[PDB]
Design an enzyme around this catalytic site. Structure first.
Site, PDB file in Angstrom:
ATOM      1  N   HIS A 114     136.055 112.968  56.541  1.00 31.44           N
ATOM      2  CA  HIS A 114     135.643 111.751  57.237  1.00 31.44           C
ATOM      3  C   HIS A 114     134.218 111.296  56.915  1.00 31.44           C
ATOM      4  CE1 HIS A 114     133.613 114.112  60.455  1.00 31.44           C
ATOM      5  NE2 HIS A 114     134.641 114.929  60.317  1.00 31.44           N
ATOM      6  N   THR A 167     129.996 110.459  68.006  1.00 27.27           N
ATOM      7  CA  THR A 167     130.776 109.284  67.683  1.00 27.27           C
ATOM      8  C   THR A 167     132.071 109.628  66.959  1.00 27.27           C
ATOM      9  OG1 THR A 167     129.702 109.013  65.569  1.00 27.27           O
ATOM     10  CG2 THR A 167     128.676 107.882  67.494  1.00 27.27           C
ATOM     11  N   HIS A 217     127.571 106.992  57.953  1.00 26.99           N
ATOM     12  CA  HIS A 217     128.737 106.152  58.194  1.00 26.99           C
ATOM     13  C   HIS A 217     128.482 104.864  57.420  1.00 26.99           C
ATOM     14  CE1 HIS A 217     129.824 108.653  61.774  1.00 26.99           C
ATOM     15  NE2 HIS A 217     128.519 108.854  61.753  1.00 26.99           N
TER      16      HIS A 217
HETATM   17 ZN   LIG Z   1     127.408 110.322  62.571  1.00 31.52          ZN
END
Ligand SMILES: [Zn+2]
EC number: 4.2.1.1
Length: 257
Positions: A61, A195, A93
């Site tokens: 991820h 998150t 991210h």
């Molecule tokens: Zn993060």
């Protein structure tokens, strides 16, 4: 399992992780006009001179640059924090296009990406114990905009080809995270959460006001990573961000006037 696709993305997470609808979830929108200067905040102390990076890992991820956290070598203190927080890893991210990618937003503005330097409170002994505490983690968040290259990011970008797919890692020693910081340490802070699942409500968030600039070529290389494992159908690792969550009964404090 959870991810960022249509059928397993952030709007589904609550089914396995009900805290997804909790009272201190992250990220949030930072409304700059409503954030209040807090004169009680102490100066922020980022002490990374003795940082020991070890490895870079594609975990399916994101990619984590991991550090030796078996001693106080790279620590975050001060600001809103009580005590000492050890750097364990950083990751990013990012988006499929430059107009999205960040998790936090600023007056609803999305940045191209967001860097998270993750630290755990040494009073809890280990990371696994820390995440079970409301003051267990401190994450320094830094926005990325696309423009000039960030020289201190290039060593990261150039190793990404070697960890294209989930589960791949590579040696990543002697990397200096000080090269990823902006000039100013002015910040906003609020109590929040991871998150990513398990979304534990264990983080003091410290989000820097000043973004760093990275080049289009640098972020393009992030977007060549894969969520999938080797040999599997290619799913580009892009849009691995959670959107802003309700602020609820929280106040965002500013370190600056
Ligand atoms: Zn993060």
């Amino acid at each position: 399992h959870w991810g960022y696709g249509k059928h397993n993305g952030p709007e589904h997470w609550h089914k396995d992780f009900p805290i997804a609808k909790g009272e201190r979830q992250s990220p949030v929108d930072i409304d700059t006009h409503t954030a209040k200067y807090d004169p009680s905040l102490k100066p922020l102390s980022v002490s990374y001179d003795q940082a020991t990076s070890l490895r870079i890992l594609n975990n399916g991820h994101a990619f984590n640059v991991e550090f030796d956290d078996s001693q106080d070598k790279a620590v975050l203190k001060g600001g809103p924090l009580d005590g000492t927080y050890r750097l364990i890893q950083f990751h990013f991210h990012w988006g499929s296009l430059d107009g999205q990618g960040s998790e936090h937003t600023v007056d609803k503005k999305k940045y191209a990406a967001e860097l998270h330097l993750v630290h755990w409170n040494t009073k809890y002994g280990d990371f696994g114990k820390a995440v079970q505490q409301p003051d267990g983690l401190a994450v320094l968040g830094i926005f990325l905009k696309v423009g000039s290259a960030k020289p201190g990011l290039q060593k990261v970008v150039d190793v990404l080809d070697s960890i294209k797919t989930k589960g791949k890692s590579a040696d990543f020693t002697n990397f200096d995270p000080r090269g990823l910081l902006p000039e100013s340490l002015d910040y906003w802070t609020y109590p929040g959460s991871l998150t990513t699942p398990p979304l534990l409500e264990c983080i003091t968030w410290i989000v820097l006001k000043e973004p760093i600039s990275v080049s289009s070529e640098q972020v393009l290389k992030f977007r060549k990573l894969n969520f999938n494992g080797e040999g599997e159908p290619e799913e580009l690792m892009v849009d691995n961000w959670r959107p802003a969550q309700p602020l609820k009964n929280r106040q965002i404090k500013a370190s600056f006037k």
